[PDB]
Amino acid sequence: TTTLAFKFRHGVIVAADSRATAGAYIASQTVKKVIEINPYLLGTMAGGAADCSFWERLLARQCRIYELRNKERISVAAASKLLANMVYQYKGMGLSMGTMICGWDKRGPGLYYVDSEGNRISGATFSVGSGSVYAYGVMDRGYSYDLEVEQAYDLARRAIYQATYRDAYSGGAVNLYHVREDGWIRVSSDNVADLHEKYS
Amino acid sequence: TQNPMVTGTSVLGVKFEGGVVIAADMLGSYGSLARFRNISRIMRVNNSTMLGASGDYADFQYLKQVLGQMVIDEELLGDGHSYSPRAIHSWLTRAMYSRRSKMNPLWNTMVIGGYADGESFLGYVDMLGVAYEAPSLATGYGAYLAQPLLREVLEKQPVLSQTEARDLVERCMRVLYYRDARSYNRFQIATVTEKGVEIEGPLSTETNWDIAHM
Amino acid sequence: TTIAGVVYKDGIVLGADTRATEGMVVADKNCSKIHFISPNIYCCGAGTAADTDMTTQLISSNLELHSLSTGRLPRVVTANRMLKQMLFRYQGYIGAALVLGGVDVTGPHLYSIYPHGSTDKLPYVTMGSGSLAAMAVFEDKFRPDMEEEEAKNLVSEAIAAGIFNDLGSGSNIDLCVISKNKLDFLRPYTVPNKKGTRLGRYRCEKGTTAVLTEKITPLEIE
Amino acid sequence: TTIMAVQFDGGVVLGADSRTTTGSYIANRVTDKLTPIHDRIFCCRSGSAADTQAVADAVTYQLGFHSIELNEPPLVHTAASLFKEMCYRYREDLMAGIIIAGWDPQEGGQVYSVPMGGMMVRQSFAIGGSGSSYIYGYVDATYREGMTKEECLQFTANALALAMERDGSSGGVIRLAAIAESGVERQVLLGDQIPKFAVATL
Amino acid sequence: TTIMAVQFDGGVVLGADSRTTTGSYIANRVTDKLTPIHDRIFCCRSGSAADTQAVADAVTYQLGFHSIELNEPPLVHTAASLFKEMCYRYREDLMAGIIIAGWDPQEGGQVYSVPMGGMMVRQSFAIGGSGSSYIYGYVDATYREGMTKEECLQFTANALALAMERDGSSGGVIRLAAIAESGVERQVLLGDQIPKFAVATL
Amino acid sequence: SIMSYNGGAVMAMKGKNCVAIAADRRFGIQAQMVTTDFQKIFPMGDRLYIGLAGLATDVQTVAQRLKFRLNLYELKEGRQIKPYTLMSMVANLLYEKRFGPYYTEPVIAGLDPKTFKPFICSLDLIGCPMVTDDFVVSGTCAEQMYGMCESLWEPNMDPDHLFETISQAMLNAVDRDAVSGMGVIVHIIEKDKITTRTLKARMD
Amino acid sequence: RFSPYVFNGGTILAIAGEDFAIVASDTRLSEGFSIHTRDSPKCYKLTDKTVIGCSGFHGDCLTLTKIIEARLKMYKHSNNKAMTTGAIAAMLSTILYSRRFFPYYVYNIIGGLDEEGKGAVYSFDPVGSYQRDSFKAGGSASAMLQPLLDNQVGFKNMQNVEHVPLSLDRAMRLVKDVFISAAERDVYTGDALRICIVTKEGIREETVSLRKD
Amino acid sequence: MEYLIGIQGPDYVLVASDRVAASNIVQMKDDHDKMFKMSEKILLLCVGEAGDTVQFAEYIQKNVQLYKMRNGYELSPTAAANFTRRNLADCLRSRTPYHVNLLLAGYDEHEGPALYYMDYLAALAKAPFAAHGYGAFLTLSILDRYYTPTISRERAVELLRKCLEELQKRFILNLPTFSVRIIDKNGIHDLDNISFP
Amino acid sequence: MEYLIGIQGPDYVLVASDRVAASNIVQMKDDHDKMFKMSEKILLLCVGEAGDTVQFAEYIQKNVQLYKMRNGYELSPTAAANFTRRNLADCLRSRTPYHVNLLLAGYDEHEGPALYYMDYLAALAKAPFAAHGYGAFLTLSILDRYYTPTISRERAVELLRKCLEELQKRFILNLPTFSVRIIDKNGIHDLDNISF
Amino acid sequence: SYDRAITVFSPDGHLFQVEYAQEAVKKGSTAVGVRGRDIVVLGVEKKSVAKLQDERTVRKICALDDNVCMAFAGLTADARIVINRARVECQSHRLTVEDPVTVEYITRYIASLKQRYTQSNGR
């Protein structure tokens, strides 16, 4: 798999492929790696899809509880900290998990990369999975904070495309998402075959 | 039992018109040694049910006392209810699966046969909790050797008589005595029917050995 | 794999299935697990298929030499000894389990050969995955000095038991009947299982598939 | 398996079961472990069937060549020595235990035991195989100096039956041989012919 | 080690060797492997001496408490069942092979064999230990229904002597016990008292 | 799986007076692709083709050794090789290395030069010949394309239907495994001509 | 030494439509190279609108279907309504993930009608990752079966063909054909084929023979 | 660890290598030359386990120059590639396997430029661009993005600098300077070494 | 690995750390901060396994701030060092052992500046200078050469820069920028980040 | 452990223990708190200075965190216990959710604690 997330002026962009594999067998080419935790923040999957989905759903219920109690929506840093502290208890017990928690808060756009190993790090660019290495090059060469929204969409698409082209365990269809101060939106679900027709 | 110590070999079973019959050799083997040559690996759970087991005989004794106390309590209540063979099959399946999930498995492989409500039951249980019903059953190397004969016979003839089933079982036991090394000539037959469980004494397979002179 | 052999009154009957499996998926549904060693000697193979085929070819070669040098038909003990010496030299690494059968001047002789070089002369033997079921059938219904038809039916029943009770074996039954005077090699002796007819037609019309390049090359003929 | 040999005055007796096993499955229930190395020299075979058959054939080859070039009947000590050098040179590869018996004019009836590791020991009575364990006591008690041919045959049959009932690897029909100046008398005991011993039968 | 018990009319006889080995070293050459669980009940211990002594003492404790509670003499089936429960609960932990023997009024002389794994079976005669292998044949042959106390004692002594000669782990002296209505009479055979079976000679 | 290190898939099919043989194009390390122009089908005659899948180095080495032996054969004999003969040669070649084997599973497809009768075969890792009348496969997605061919294939197909069949099979198969794909090439053999076509396939 | 898992074979299929959901499976059960029985359906009825198929270790399959029936009863007792298919799926994901560190080695498929009335198919990993699909295969021959369904039902890699919605008759014929082929070229499947279809009226079960081994 | 990169074009081959020789934590050398010329117009780039690299490269260099002296004409890049592939493939079964990851580059007057790739298993391949090392994972996506078969050499050097600066920003190891040289009809040409202070 | 360095002086203690956070072969982050502020006058630098560092550091952080809130006065640096040493040593024999290589720096009005060292085994050692990571092997020699007990903060910064440029030239890993800050009586002071 | 219902309902539905606790609060030292737009203020009345006491020890104004402060009235000991538990919670909240507490959060914790003591057994 492969995922992508970066911060720019008009919010946060999240992109991911749609392939799921067991060994060399492509079980699914329509899996939604990005998870809509709630209308105001969302997450991604890499590693154990079961692990990521379960723990992020647990995070979702915790976030709703926090919202109800405090009457203020939880911050991205707090959410990532909850997730990290939860998975850290199960450290060394075989969890394979990697995700990028994305949202807006009082501070601004939020992006945090949590991992089963224990790392929790904010940033302006992140890429997780087998194709992350191929994604980083395109994103790094094409990324600027001063960047039009359509340009951001395009470079996310192209990064995921090249990552799929090179990596065997990623493919299917990009599932692009855009976080704005009001909430996230799904902008496109383009297929890499149509994108190959486009870019070549 | 992480490693079994004293083991019993194959148990057979086949259901006929109006009852079920199972058979087992009276042997407990301590690693290629026929140490105990007179043991019943067949149990009488209740009037409508009988049980036969392979594998670790001690685990089988444990199941014997447990299940005996269970049916005893069911009798004590005097409520007009008795455990069905399929109910015992389910209970046993859960027990073996639980012991497996704790990684403390009961190494036995069981065959439950019973007759109740005018219906004949025959079920299998493995140490891992695998369970199923079939018209015929075999455990151990019996699964490879005897079950072909039973399956061919049952496929050509879906329903059998008591005498035909008994002859078939004795034939399969002869085959096992020939081609299995953890086997013994002495074996018990247990049959369940409308009358109830009737376990026969030690029987012989009556080998020929005419092949040797060639 | 299920191979089996039996001695009837005036010869030998060999039988085998035709299912060749790479792992747990079928690769060949009509394999020939019956090989030619000599006109009067035949063999069936199980285990490592390449080892069985190449060993049988080698011994067939050496026996061709021996036979046409001597001017008389080859014997079965010769093949058995060649095979066991070879297999012992390789110490079981070549995984050729064979049942070997032939008729010669002394009479019908049937051998079962194991990968480590062991042998056993028997009236009936079975090898492979369905060997136990076939042994069951033989221990039940074998009698000495059977007629040819009875022996063929017995071997068919045995191979069928191995088929319908073992996952590895299937798809057909092959027979070979060697005697003093004839050899009847019956490749589709029986068809117990067949593929069911396809209810739906899925034939794709022209242009169903896209193409990005095409290059036609004519072949000169004369 | 169980193999057994006994020396009587003027010959020997060989006995062995007919079972060879691969795991818990009996590949052959009528195998003949008694093998003629020569007209008056026999070999019983324990361990790897392949190893024993191979070394038996090679010893037969060498001993036939030696006997024919000498123009005199071979010796049991000679055959045992051949087996010894083979099994000792290849003690690492071969898992084989042998017991050799025959008759020759110079020494008469002889029994030699070649266990695993390639040592050679002449013995009055010698047992081998997985089942010899269970009958060491029976032979220690029952043996007596000066037994005859029929007496030794019955002794061997009883011993082999006792081993066969207890040992899973041993079983089948008992094959017997008696070797002397006259020649070889082979017989096979099956079913009721085999001696029977009463179970506890509580 | 080698232990052995046999049931006669009106009682039982127990026998055992007297050697405990740590590897190839004999720590105790005069150990008593016959432990009285009660006045009329005895135990013969094989396997780990520590495990056997522990379970023996615990069963003795439980059984004495049960007996004094009931104000009736205990049953051999009861003792064997206690041993069985312990050895089956802790079958993974301890390696112990037991053969319990005793007399009770209602059932008379009884012999139970609790091998490793925690199973229990009544037996007319039963043997255990490393040496029992070497005498399975002797006992299967020479056992007879209706033997006397003296006959069973000689039988047990002969068997233990054979096992002691052949097995390295068993040896020393033979301890014997005969249990009946009257009580227990223990005797120890040493030196010439052991039955001697002649070793073969050339 | 040493075979899965490079991946790859090769397939052959039979028709009426025609054979088809197809193979993927990807050359890649266990997850990283390198090139989409890899040659896994090599021509061993005018109308005889061999197709190799497995470890790519062994693919190349086997093809080279086979061309060596084959050219010597064609020069000494003075005729083109028969497909059964090539099968036997390949089996001997692979069994020469039975310990330390070439990690490739060949597929041969062609017409007999005299009668133009279709022939297809496959060989195991160590040279077990397996002649069939319908189709043969080798590769990582073998399990997929077996069922795909079992369904789509029909007897005595003409070249058009044969092409559409083998194309649909290869595409729908390699789309479903990771380490194979990146296009697919289809050689069609018949008495008069040879036709080679590349297919439009998902490059993911 | 002791292995708590063994592959009992089994193959399962699920197809969805506008007003129907088809679930089908083989009936063979086999440990190792030996058949245990030829009549063991992998497809169980959870409720009127739902069918579940399970493939893999039969003990885990049994415990799982037991737990699901129990929790369906519990849900009904508590909330006074029957569970929907998505709810069953989510509960099953939680169940499977509960024992993540000693998993059920079972591949499951849910097949049912949703509240809207459409067909639904949820496909699970052994560890509880669940994804809605229009069609899915599971078990030993899933790799064999999925390509043909992707070609026919999904119209993948097919050029200029009508994207017709699937119909009941075509679906039934298709599943019969694919299981025929999988029986032809897979050892673990082949005893028989039970087709348990769910529709608005209820669940109908049909059976068709396959080639015995 | 070591990084190689190759870019084919219409009329030239561009190759680059890191100049780092590292045994362990320490970096021993900063001007290591991983480029061996087998002839006037073909280069061999070799990386992998220590010693195997130079041994194999010098062996191939010897054989190629020997071919030249014997026959009067240099080998083609394709022939050199298949030759080194054969020698490498023969050895992996042998007791002396050469664990080396290679990248060959040459220009033929007839067949034009060429770039070949072979891993330690000796699987050959002709590619328009290729790379070795862990850095290849980062830089290959750059080339797949911005590469065209009609690329001019100035644009190629630009693309190279993009790949290398991405390595500097994003790759854990320290690869400060890179050797560069171009192959064309005229011959091998050394260029200014790309450095990042 | 991650690089830390400490340089004690007469009236100050200087600390530096690399700013990179890494994945298998990729620099995920270039502005990571490995310095934790337990109080106004002490710092904690932690490197090691992922997650253990943050969890342990923030546990010590909240414990120290809790001491302050409860008692009205901040802990001494030696006291905080022994406290974290206890918390770490208690755990190495437990089921959940942290694997953290620490470097602690603080100023006390009475005792003066202090620099403490402890490895993943919780062995505490006060030192005039110290370092962690594979780079310490390279840089400690430079400190042993060019360090004196009486050293101005300007010369200390220059010495630090020497060490870091040695790393840049001679160390395989890419540590392009280093965070720097200094502790004294006035408080913690962040300085210009050294970069190349 | 000691489990008994110290706090229970009375006829007419009053928790007498809670009423008595509020009575004890009324006995305590007076305190006043007022809110301003940019400043917030607390004041407490010393019962008796006593001219020997160290004022620092007996301060009834305490700081739960940097941005929070509280005063109390009633039992000084119970106040101290509650203060320490509030302090550990505000620090753990910083730890968990990476931001300082709000007064709503901390007073919610304190009220929950006091309620738990009104309902739990043995307290």
UniProtKB/Swiss-Prot annotation, chain F:
CC terms in the record's Gene Ontology section: cytoplasm; cytosol; extracellular exosome; nucleoplasm; nucleus; proteasome complex; proteasome core complex; proteasome core complex, beta-subunit complex
Residue numbers carrying N6-acetyllysine: K76
SUPFAM superfamilies, per database record: N-terminal nucleophile aminohydrolases (Ntn hydrolases) (SSF56235)
Residue(s) carrying N-acetylserine: S1
Keyword Cytoplasm applies: yes
Induction and repression of expression: Up-regulated in asthenozoospermic sperm.
Keyword Cytoplasm: yes
Location(s) in or outside the cell: Cytoplasm; Nucleus
Keyword set, alphabetical order: Acetylation, Cytoplasm, Host-virus interaction, Nucleus, Proteasome
UniProt GO BP: proteasome-mediated ubiquitin-dependent protein catabolic process
CDD domains: proteasome_beta_type_3
Domain of life the protein comes from: Eukaryota
Subunit structure comment from the entry: The 26S proteasome consists of a 20S proteasome core and two 19S regulatory subunits. The 20S proteasome core is a barrel-shaped complex made of 28 subunits that are arranged in four stacked rings. The two outer rings are each formed by seven alpha subunits, and the two inner rings are formed by seven beta subunits. The proteolytic activity is exerted by three beta-subunits PSMB5, PSMB6 and PSMB7.
Function description: Non-catalytic component of the 20S core proteasome complex involved in the proteolytic degradation of most intracellular proteins. This complex plays numerous essential roles within the cell by associating with different regulatory particles. Associated with two 19S regulatory particles, forms the 26S proteasome and thus participates in the ATP-dependent degradation of ubiquitinated proteins.
UniProtKB/Swiss-Prot annotation, chain G:
Main subcellular location: cytoplasm
Entry superkingdom: Eukaryota
Cellular component aspect of the GO annotation: cytoplasm; cytosol; extracellular exosome; extracellular region; ficolin-1-rich granule lumen; nucleoplasm; nucleus; proteasome complex
Subcellular location: Cytoplasm; Nucleus
Membrane-crossing segments per the record: none
Pfam families per UniProt: Proteasome (PF00227)
CDD domains in UniProt: proteasome_beta_type_1
GO BP terms, alphabetized: proteasome-mediated ubiquitin-dependent protein catabolic process; proteolysis involved in protein catabolic process
Phosphotyrosine carried by residues: Y122
Residues where N6-acetyllysine is found: K176
Phosphoserine found at: S34, S40, S134
S-S bridge residues: none
Keywords for the protein's UniProt record, in alphabetical order: Acetylation, Cytoplasm, Deafness, Glycoprotein, Host-virus interaction, Intellectual disability, Nucleus, Phosphoprotein, Proteasome
Glycan-bearing residues: S30, S181
InterPro entries: Ntn_hydrolases_N (IPR029055), Proteasome_bsu_CS (IPR016050), Proteasome_sua/b (IPR001353), Proteasome_suB-type (IPR023333)
Keyword Glycoprotein set for record: yes
Function per UniProt: Non-catalytic component of the 20S core proteasome complex involved in the proteolytic degradation of most intracellular proteins. This complex plays numerous essential roles within the cell by associating with different regulatory particles. Associated with two 19S regulatory particles, forms the 26S proteasome and thus participates in the ATP-dependent degradation of ubiquitinated proteins.
Family, as annotated: Belongs to the peptidase T1B family.
Name under which the protein is recorded: Proteasome subunit beta type-1
Origin species: Homo sapiens
Protein's gene: PSMB1
From Swiss-Prot, chain H:
GO biological process: one example: proteasome-mediated ubiquitin-dependent protein catabolic process
Designated gene of the protein: PSMB2
SUPFAM superfamilies: N-terminal nucleophile aminohydrolases (Ntn hydrolases) (SSF56235)
Keywords: Acetylation, Cytoplasm, Host-virus interaction, Nucleus, Proteasome
Lineage, broadest ranks: Eukaryota, Metazoa, Chordata, Craniata, Vertebrata
Protein name per its UniProtKB record: Proteasome subunit beta type-2
Subcellular location: Cytoplasm; Nucleus
Family: Belongs to the peptidase T1B family.
Top-level lineage group: Eukaryota
InterPro entries: Ntn_hydrolases_N, Proteasome_beta2, Proteasome_bsu_CS, Proteasome_sua/b, Proteasome_suB-type
PANTHER family, alphabetized: METALLOPROTEASE TLDD (PTHR32194), PROTEASOME SUBUNIT BETA TYPE-1 (PTHR32194:SF2)
Subunit (UniProt): The 26S proteasome consists of a 20S proteasome core and two 19S regulatory subunits. The 20S proteasome core is a barrel-shaped complex made of 28 subunits that are arranged in four stacked rings. The two outer rings are each formed by seven alpha subunits, and the two inner rings are formed by seven beta subunits. The proteolytic activity is exerted by three beta-subunits PSMB5, PSMB6 and PSMB7. (Microbial infection) Interacts with HIV-1 protein Tat.
Keyword Cytoplasm part of the UniProt annotation: yes
Organism whose genome encodes this protein: Homo sapiens (Human)
A GO CC term assigned to this protein in UniProt: nucleus
UniProtKB/Swiss-Prot annotation, chain J:
Subcellular localization, as worded in the UniProt entry: Cytoplasm; Nucleus
Induction: Down-regulated by the ribozyme Rz3'X. Up-regulated in colorectal cancer tissues.
Annotated GO biological process: proteasome-mediated ubiquitin-dependent protein catabolic process
Outcome of swapping A111D: Found in patient with severe intellectual disability; uncertain significance
GO molecular function per UniProt: identical protein binding
Post-translational modification: Phosphorylation by ABL1 or ABL2 leads to an inhibition of proteasomal activity and cell cycle transition blocks.
A Gene Ontology term for the protein's cellular component: proteasome core complex
Keywords from the UniProt entry: Acetylation, Cytoplasm, Glycoprotein, Host-virus interaction, Nucleus, Phosphoprotein, Proteasome
Cited function: Component of the 20S core proteasome complex involved in the proteolytic degradation of most intracellular proteins. This complex plays numerous essential roles within the cell by associating with different regulatory particles. Associated with two 19S regulatory particles, forms the 26S proteasome and thus participates in the ATP-dependent degradation of ubiquitinated proteins.
Family: Belongs to the peptidase T1A family.
Protein name: Proteasome subunit alpha type-7
Coverage span on the entire protein: 2 to 124 of 248
